[PDB]
């Protein structure tokens, strides 16, 4: 740690404090994150999981019972960008570019059997060139997803897939597609899709929009650990009501990212081939 000079505190992560710092040896500016042998091996494997849409893990430093992760530094997150773009909305070509790039990062990680598990706007970092990158990939498997952060802050449920809420502990890469579909809808509408404040509120918000799932749409759902036959039965809403003014190609893609059955849910690779991306470009964001 003596090789890093702290510049400023940049945030409070799920696992520990995040600082902007300067590497005295290389001169580079980095994001330094303060955080068991199984975790060291898993985190070490992430140093080789390199892609332009994945925030680069520069180093892992384990010293005197503390773990430090050194990441490439990016100047803002999507949560702050969406808040700053609230009055006007993020332009559709930029939403499309961001979704396209995030799907590329997921397709790469998923091809290596690495899941994120906790995607959220605060974990999506942008630069002034038009890129967006996935932060903290693989950290949920190495350290778990807690109910509360190290500062006691509630970990958001808003982007959590229904199979996790229903008690599947052996979930798939589909959980990340669900989270990204929720984020896509939020960029379009400027409001969170499913802002639950408890596990049951999260589930019931999903059910009130997509319909209460049953054996027809999701074979095996009624046998899941936390499924209860007493769940209320709500009808499914049309996506034309849920995400206006998104065009039919965008609504088709979103609906496939939000399928209940993880086996039916579109993969990141198949999503990249969707006609919604026919006219994709890479605009420069207004920052």
Q: Would you give an account of this structure?
A:
This protein has 287 residues and is α+β, with helices and mostly antiparallel strands. A five-stranded antiparallel beta sheet has the order 1-2-3-5-4, covered by helices on one side. A three-stranded antiparallel beta sheet has the order 6-7-8. α3 packs antiparallel against α6 (174-189). The chain has ten helices and eight strands. Helices cover 32% and strands 15% of the residues. The chain has two domains: 1-75, Phosphorylase Kinase, domain 1 (2-Layer Sandwich), CATH 3.30.200; 76-287, Transferase(Phosphotransferase), domain 1 (Orthogonal Bundle), CATH 1.10.510.
List keywords for this structure.
serine/threonine-protein kinase, Transferase(Phosphotransferase), domain 1, five-stranded antiparallel β-sheet, Cyclin-dependent kinase 2, mitosis, monomer, three-stranded antiparallel β-sheet, 2 domains, alpha+beta, Phosphorylase Kinase, domain 1, 287 residues
